[model samples]
Target: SKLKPFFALVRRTNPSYGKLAFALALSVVTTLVSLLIPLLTKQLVDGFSMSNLSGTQIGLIALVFFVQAGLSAYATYALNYNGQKIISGLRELLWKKLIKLPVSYFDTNASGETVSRVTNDTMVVKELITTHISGFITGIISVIGSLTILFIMNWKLTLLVLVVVPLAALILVPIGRKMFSISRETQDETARFTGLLNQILPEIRLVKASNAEDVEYGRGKMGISSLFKLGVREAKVQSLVGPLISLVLMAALVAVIGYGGMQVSSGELTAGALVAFILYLFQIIMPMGQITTFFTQLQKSIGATERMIEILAEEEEDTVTGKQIENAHLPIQLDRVSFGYKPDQLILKEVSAVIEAGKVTAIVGPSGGGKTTLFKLLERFYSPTAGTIRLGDEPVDTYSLESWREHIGYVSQESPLMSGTIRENICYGLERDVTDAEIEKAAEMAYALNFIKELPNQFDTEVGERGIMLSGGQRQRIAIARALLRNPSILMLDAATSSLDSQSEKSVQQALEVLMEGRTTIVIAHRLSTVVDADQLLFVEKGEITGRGTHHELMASHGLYRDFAEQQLKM
Candidate 1:
């Protein structure tokens, strides 16, 4: 079953199955108490005499009712208490797996849908345990116990009981099967809907700027339209289920009572026996709806379990704990490195380069020519399919994941920022606590200090969601400050001032130099800064490095490289 992991998680997280059984036992007592009452009704209807009835006979009925009420209330509390504890630990286990998962895992899966599994799907386990299971167990007992009594009440009516019981189950079985599949379809669409919301909401400004309200509305309606279709399909099944249960109960009740009335009139059955017979029939038939619902929810919970297990079972990256990187400053080398998001389709092919110690190497290429893919390999986000990236004589892959990353810094063109105070953003991911003096010096070096000083709160000011409040240069300089603070041995930059006005551009360009000084720097050259500063430039096209030389040499020797240079340096 798909739910094996869920129950296994339950067992491992909460080993107190004894307490769960104890709570279940309390619920079982209510069923036993309930079963006893129909027989008491038998005595009252057959005797039909207040004078013949002793006070304790009436008092005993009251006592049983009071006992059932108290036990049932306590059972609900006990069940929920255990249920809440079990799921809290389950959700925490999943949250731990999510952060430790590799960057490559996120490429294929949507964050919103992945997160919805944790938030929404896990709750199915909670409801299944707390609300449904107890009712499910008790309904079975109530049904079976009523059948036993009705058999003794009169075997003929009990024979009809046999037919009705099987018939009611027959009606529900196919409906439960339909409901199960519908539930799974609904879960999948809801996840996709959640993914769409997550992707679109944060970029609301982009939507408005593109004047894409109608376009977005059309796309959203497509997702909604499918969901609406599944909803009606689910409703149609539910509508049939409810009426079918009623139709069986009403028809069975009329037939049994009408037949028993004739038997009583012919002196073969007593009126009181017929009365008790009706009471038992309601008990047998009533649980049909609840039992149907229990199976439907069981199917739903199984699907939820399957999705969550898909994440939990996914292979994580090589652990952070391994041999540490050594040789304090070594030339980084990529030897015949080839990779693809999928194995059959190569994105970067047979690409080889050496990033010499303390020098800038520019990566020049056309748009979508595997430049970012090359950087991703250098960052070790994905291991190369065919070759190795090395540090001096040793493969970089041999070093601890955390230790390898500690030696490198990356500043992308966007200079992505988390939503937080500027002070917090600057210090994020640094293992040790950063003193205010170090923060100030780092900002000063990056040329961000001047603008930060002008603001009233300065470092304490909040950079609104993803640093949207800051200018492009401010974000870039802050990113440079972050890199400066770490002073990693290797720095990778996609430092483009192409989007900025001249003044902000100059400041950011100045900041990039101080940040790049005396480090092995790799630049994804969007424009010509690499031509002036690069010790070597590699021309990547398709998935290969087509040419490698200083900019002047490439212009002299390589035709395509010369053409690339002429268009890029139209200045």
Candidate 2:
């Protein structure tokens, strides 16, 4: 019952069972026939004249051996094939769950950690299921059948041996638990180290920019030593399991031979029967060792499985099964919106505002005053904690998420581009095929035509990872061109040219001005020139609106707004 989730995930795979059942049938039959060898050895003693043995008897023995060997060989292949197929299904389900997860999931979890749940953990689970778990089943059958025969041969030896063996098994229990503890720790540290590798390498430039190579080197050495220590812990546990199992088995064997010799001397047991019991003893004892390893492996895999289960169970954002919105040309109204990543702290509290249809609403605020968070709300990246945003009396969130986002275009300071050609990045999300004419028109409108034509490949040039091949200003134009192609009804621009040099900023500003024409636009920036001509200006600080009006009106009525403008605006 404690492993309900582990079984639940496996059951969801809907694996086909015919081959696995067929394979098990073959393997079980093979095991039963193989179990007859000890009885045959007892018979060879009683029927001991090999010179008088019939050819048919020897032929039957050979037949049994060959049949068991052949069937087992086929069974192993069929079982492995069946097991891998089931894991492939489970692996697919895990991946589908990963992509549909919300932005907030990635926000809290490292990308590397999340990725390993799919790539690394699933493979380990496969190895456990396909290799260890299948063998554990057949090994169980062998032990139980051998024990049944052992008891029938001589109850005294069986009972005495069972008592000693179980006591030996009890000694093995805590080592299993200790190995489990180490494995769980290893899985956690490995996932975290993966996070560091993924998080740091991509931004090596940042590490060098700050001259923080020594700092990162210390972190790397620390991670390396942590994993090394866990490996050593595993070795200590493994070293104990092997020799300890042998010691217990050897002592039990000595006890059996000595006591069985006494019985033979007293005429209480036959030598042939004692020999059969000894043969069966090895069968039962070997599985006991395997049984320990099986349960230990099970506990080890449970750690990874539990992590995978946690991800699969997370509630993903619903991008489907919602009503659609036709047009976002109407004004957007936000009433008393409040939200925070945590419960106690509210980043936007009882905030209310209106974005006019086809007009600019410039948001001027301090760095952490919820301007970016507000844009995310309109984009429906997160819903407001306790309010409604309506477009023409329809609550905006009521629309399908995919449909809602298609109508809202967002350009941020970074203006990130995926690694691809300029054409692909510009045409990234368009569901329909875009014509060459449309791309050219959009690029020209964004004032990107001149620079693009000068490049060797023109529009076909590759924009390296995150568009690093292009200047910040060039990436902004490509983003602007993308927005233009979408023809979104509402656009959100966050510090679009703030990081550019004066010349690059002027070019990006010209492209943004063209894109903003006749669109419902919300602009957030430090440069007062962008906000000075806005139809409405909202001065926000500490999660509340302190001033609201056109730029001139705020200067007369709001002292802080006046001070902010006097310091920032060149005009």
Candidate 3:
């Protein structure tokens, strides 16, 4: 609805003014060249019909026609080339914005929505810029130039044609507007369905295992049905525009022939003039139809622009100057921190704790007891709503988000791995020039080197999406190796060995002990044995820290901690 912002974006992105000028010039050339056909037709009708034209005159006319064709081809080539360049520029700009946008943007919108913006919306923009804009420009130029020539040829006939043109346009306006609105809705629904499919088809295994195939099929069919309904509605409105315009043109033609015949008989207008006027009438109406199509394309492009602008407008993360987190000799302190995703529902309330330097602090909690949220806060993935989180004496928020994360290694429960060689996977996110020896050492420390050496290609083996080719225990070991390779000051083990059996866990625990020897460690523990040797244990319930002590101390002193230990001890 609001179009000013999008217009501004177009101007900002299209910085090469010379290219735009060239494109418009090419469009004008094409328009003028096309008009030559009608103008020459008028001349041929008058000059050659009475057998009065000389051979030289006929040759000149033929040459002009040939030149028009050549110019038209050249103009088309130029416009298409420039149009592609513009589309390329816009896509690059959009992609840059996509990467620079904050992490929260992805969290708020579905991945499908983002994919649609990049793919479908971008295609809409490309179509508008390449085909529609070129046609629209040429149409406008040709119509205006031909109309002027018509007025010069015969004023009365021109006025008669102009009267019908306005009437025809007025009749099409409401239908065109409705067509534009409905077409945009159709495109959006199409994008929605595409997004849904993008999400579902990727997880077919889950659907099969959960017996959700029938439900997923019905959901997909409903989306397709909705898209079909919108398409039909848009088509119904669009279908009227062409035939109605043609009807008006035919009616105008009859009026022109009748009135011009009267003038010819009355000796008020020449036969040549009347003939040219008819050709001009067709020329004008043809472009008017093209203009209708152009406006529809413009409307669709506007919708795309709106969606893209919404993405580009979000607040970017702080990539500018701030304190860089280089080392982690400082204690991480949370003083009465409180936070929530929404205002009314608190996820963490009055949570205070200290993770002492070079100490293992194991946080154990129930499923929804904010264990992950605490890690998010400490890593500055999000900031607390109230109170302070400090690294040493400085507020954590004072450091750049990128900098704060550099010293903290978080191995999430999923153990998501990149689709690269094992070596690349291990050394991901590290700065330049990491030696092969260093990577191998880290893998050995995580007990991953044994498996890596046994693999068909050793450390160069291809790990598929999330390392699905590997067992869960193997993936966790790879993740552990990756984190250990970073050698961060703080290591976060999020049920790191939860997937491994007793013998495997024992090997991993030995490797982990080597990794955690000097660095401060935080474990989101699920098994009692994992945190048995942890210096301090924090038992969390709901959003609050219920107890804090060593594993044995909590077992003796805290009932909630004792209950958790007893349950895991039995398992």
Candidate 4:
């Protein structure tokens, strides 16, 4: 029952169950063949001593041994092949789930820790399924078969072997429990160490800039030391299990020899029979030890399974494939909408607004005044705690998230770029195959064509990681081009030119003016000058719209708007 999760994974992956059965069958065959070897040896010894040993008998024993070895090899291959097939399917499934997980999951979890769950945790599950599972199954069959054969040879000696085996197994129970706890600790530490490296490597530049290399090094050393300590403790516990089991087996062997010799002297058992019993005893005891080890490792694998299950069980983003808005002039309206990242603190409260179609609506506010939060709400990254948002008289929720988002283009303040060729980055998330002419035209509209054409490779030039090869202006232009290529019905610019120098900002503003034509454009900006010509300006402060009007009207009526405009003009 404890392993039901592991079994559930197996069923979902749907590996060849026929092959698994075939492997198990081969295991049983190999064990039976191994059992036959000792009996054949007994026959050979007794026959030789009686001067009646035949060459055919010796040949038969050798053939059985060779056949067992061959079957064992094939069984191992089959088990490993099936195990890898299942693991491959599982890894692919996990990746699909990871990519589709809701944005909230990424917000709350570190990328490094999430990565460890996929890579390290999956490998542990693979080992458990392949090595430990197969070992347990094979060991049980071998132990049972060997014991049955021993009973056939000498019941009294078999009984003696059973008594010591249970005693050894009992001693292993507590040790096995300790090993399990240690295995979980070791795995967790390993993941933390892996996560730490992942966290640091991406920000190595910051570490160097801050001259905190020694500090980070110390942190890494401390993480490694914790892992090393856990490893040593696990080693100490495991080291005891092997020698203790061996000592018990040796004692059992001594008892068997002494008792059997006495029986032989009393003419109750033959020397050949006694030797066969001892061989069967060794086989039985070895597999008993193996079974204990399998249980110990199974506990560790179960821990890994729980972590994977937790990830798989997370709520996925809505799967709505919304119908596309073809007219591209849908006015967006928010009706008494309220939202908060946490329920106790509302970032947007009873906010209502109508952003007119084919007009520029500017959202101006101080930082943390919910300007960005409003954009996030419109983008459907988070849902309103209360009220409805509609596009063209239809509730936004009525449309599929994909089709709804397809009509919207968002360019943020950072102008983030992925590592790729400029052409590829520009075409990112564009559903259809875009032509070179279209890409070039979009670049021209974003004012990116002049700089792009200056580069040696033009559009095909590789942008370094996060567009490090390009300046801030270039990155922003590229991002604008990416959004422009989509030709969305609604354009959202969140302080798009805020991070640029005066010269770059002027260039981008001109491009944005061109792009905003004939679309419902929403601009969130700190600089009030950029939105002076806006058809409507909404002043948002403290999660509420304090004032709304055209720039001149707001300057005459709203004190906050007038003061903000004056402050920006002076700067």
Candidate 5:
């Protein structure tokens, strides 16, 4: 049952079992051939005293020795080949699972720790399957074969050798358990350090700006110090295992030699038989050590497997698997919707609204007033805690997630851009083939073509990480161009032009107007000028919609909307 996880990984990869079977078969053949070597040595030694050793017999021994060596080498190669193939397949499956995991999984776990599980922990499991497991099977076979030989030669000496088996087990079993615990602690420490590096490296600029270099350095030192202490503890436990096993086995060997010598002296056993028994005793002792080491390594691998198993056990997001709605101009309505990131603290409370098709609906609110939360719910990033959201005549959940999302486009204040060529970023997430001419037309519509043509490489130019090469206005235009290319029926813009200077803001606003034409547009805005012409304006405060009307009507009503509009105009 402990091996069930490892075997499950094997099944996931769907590797050829025939190759694995061949490898095991070769291993057995190699072991059988190796067993014949000691027997040959016995025959050669027994013939020496009787003057019965001939050229042909010596030649036969040499031939058997070479054949056994050759078979063992081939067996090792086959095992390694199969092992590597299995490891590669398992790693691929792990990567696929990691990416498909729900966004919430990333919220709770460190990215660095997840990466370590994929790379480091998987390598540990590979060592277990490839080397330790093969060694274990071969060791058991060798030990049994050596014991049979020892018994045939001299039962008394064999019984003396057998005494060390239980003794070795007593020394290894408890220590093996301790090593497993230590190994798990060590892995966690390593992941912590890796997670620290991952967190700091991406935000190095922030660290520098805040002058927190010394603070991060101290934190890194703490992580390393913890790992160092764990390493020392693991070494202390592991150090005890090898020495104790060796000491017990040596004592047993000495006892066997003493008893066997007396038997030879009493004429109960021949000198050749005594020598053969000692040789077989050495084989038994070596395989015993190997078996012990195999179990110890197995324990460590089980620890690693448990970490990966934990990730695999997480519940995935519920995705739409049924038929999808394809209409883009569907009206959206939210009724008495409530939501909270946590159960006790609600961000939105019974918020209700109707977003008409092919019209601009602007949401105006104070900070932390659940404007963005409303957009997230509309996108189905999080479901409403209470109430219903509908698109057209059906609930939003009735539409397939992918198809529903395809009809919606979202742009935020940050205007995120990936590190890639401009063309790639522009076409990101679009599944169908996009022609260059279509791309240019989208850029023209967003008013981005003028600046894009001025660049040396045009569409082929590489956007540095997060589009650092582009200004705020430039990134916003490109993002707008991307959204326009999708030709979405619902466009959600959250403070899209809030960070830009007046001139840049005016240009991006013009582009946004072009994109928003005849689409269901939702704007979350702090600036009132952008929403003055909106078909409808909703004022939200303290997790509820305080007022809703056209800008002129809201101003006439003298409510929160008018108050916010007057304040912004004064600024």
Candidate 6:
């Protein structure tokens, strides 16, 4: 059942399967024609020496040989072309499936596993098409063609060869099953180690910072060692197969010679006929040996196929929803919402609140009290675990996630920016034509225009990764300018002003106040002074809101809010 879908992918991607089948049929014909050469040789040896054959009979034999050679060349060329097409189709399908997989799938499976599938697993399938499938198909054709010729020559010799085949086949059934299981485990381990290496190398900076270099190195080595051990075990089993096959082949040859010698001695078979029969018998065994090797390689390809199938089967995020939230002018509401990244450790619990539209609302809490989690909810990066979040009367989940995200902008404690021009960074969220005038207006409103215009290229200057080339204040202003250009209905700022120097902080805060005009804003601030003018304030602790009011009212009525204000006042 698992393999059924893999074949379906092949069928869907390869409209050229019909071409491949035609090529295979031609190969079968070519194989049958090639068998006649040995039969013709038998006749020449038996009768030509007697000098009874005419020139026309010799000419006919030569023509048959030339035609068979042509058919053989055509068949080989067609099969190679067909294999290339199939491999191209498979590679294209795998890449399409990989990119469409959800972010959650990557979080669980890791990058190394993906690399293994794209690189190592695909190589196995490539080998199958180039070598295994071709060999299997041709070998079967040879076996069937040889058997047909042997039957025509002498049924007694044919029956003798057929009797030994079943015993040779019986040995493979158990060995084939064992080989398949081992190969599957081997590939899984290889993928796991590949994934381990990917995870470690990317975080080498963190490893050094935490002084965990030795610890991570040991873990990586252990994964690789496990794979090495499995590889050796697989090789040991595979090595025995070839010698066992040769032993069976030698025994079959002895049986055939003994039986044919008796027939010749009794005058039932002529000497020339016996020689051709022996050659055909050897040809039959040759294909049988090739078939055995093909089956071994198939075991490895089947393992790869299973891994590829897993990626293709992942559930992708939906692109459409019935309603759009951007057109609605409703307050963001969370109704008894509960959520957790993990199943058991609840991050937010039965949390319900309304953030008033077009007002500055502040959420102040101790670290890990779900302040950032609340921002994530409004952005719809995740849906609530047990309840609903609404924008006005419409549930957040009813809106397409992309549409909702487009209407909400988030600025984190670290204002991250990619390596691009200031114009590109500011216009990123618009996804539509943004004129230079619009970019200038947004930068001026965010109080970044004066500093931005002073740069060597001004609006066209590149801000390096995470805005390292720019100061913390410049990065913060650029992020605010970027968000302002989109004109999101809701703006969420998490510790946005935490990293600014006094002069830059004053200018950035002034810009923040301007950008907050007419937009519903939610801010998480440790500096109580920064949020003193907020229209409303909420104090949170341990996944629960302990207080909600204007700053003055909270200082008078809430012990926690008063404690927070008192502590910040000391600084």
Winner by TM-score:
1
3 against 5, candidate with superior lDDT:
5
Residue by residue across 1-571, what tens digits does model 5's lDDT show? Answer: 9678866766776866887677777777777877777777777776775544556678888998788788777877877887788788878777777677565425455867778777988888777776776778888888787767666765665465566656765765676687788888888888888888998898998999999999989988888888888888888877886687677667765666777777789888557777766666666667666687877877778878787777777655444444556666866787887764665877777888877787777776665567667656766767555657766566467666767777667787675678887887656846575645677666665566777647567656888766677677677777777777776567877757765788877776666667567878777776666677577877776778776777775644644546656565547
**Tens-digit per-residue lDDT, 1-571, candidate 3:** 4569766766756655676567678668657766766656666655654554645556767887777677667766766676667677777877777776566525466867787777888778766766776778788888777767777777766466557756865776676687678778877888888899999998999999999899999998898888888878877777787687678768766676777777778887557677766666667777676688887877778878888888777766664637755566776687887874565777888888877777777876666668767766655656466757766566467666666566667776576677777767756746564745676665655567777537667555888755666777777677766666676567877766665678767766666677666778777776677568577778777777777767775555564546556466556
Residue 249 local lDDT, model 6 = 69
Cα lDDT tens digits for candidate 2, 476-504: 76676677677657777775767577787
Reference-based TM-score of each model: 0.78, 0.72, 0.75, 0.75, 0.72, 0.63
Model 5 scores worst on lDDT over the 10 consecutive residues at: 315-324
> Of the pair 2 and 6, which is ahead by TM-score?
2
Assess the local accuracy of residue 28 in candidate 6 as a C-alpha lDDT between 0 and 100: 72
Compared with the true structure, the alpha-carbon lDDT of candidate 4 equals: 0.73
Which scores better on TM-score, 2 or 3? 3
Measured on C-alpha atoms, candidate 2 has an lDDT of 0.72
Q: How big is the positional error of residue 492 in model 5, measured in Å on the Cα after superposition?
A: 1.1
| lDDT of all predictions | 0.73, 0.72, 0.70, 0.73, 0.72, 0.70
Across 221-340, the per-residue lDDT of candidate 1 in tens digits comes to 998998899899888977887788778767766666677887788887657777766666667677778788888888778878777777777666654546766744777787887765
**Per-prediction backbone clash count:** 0, 0, 0, 1, 0, 0
**Model 6 worst lDDT run, 10 consecutive residues:** 100-109
lDDT of 6 by residue, 324-360 (tens): 5557456768778777456587887877777788778
Show where candidate 5 strays beyond 4 Å. Answer: 1-9, 49-62, 97-110, 158-279, 287-290, 293-327, 339-348, 364-372, 413-416, 458-460, 464-473, 525-535, 551-571
**lDDT (Cα, 0-100) at 205 in candidate 3:** 92
Candidate closer to the true structure by lDDT (higher is better), 3 or 6? 3
What local lDDT score does residue 104 receive in model 5, on the 0 to 100 scale?
46
Q: List the residue pairs that clash in candidate 3.
A: none
lDDT of 3 at 270: 57
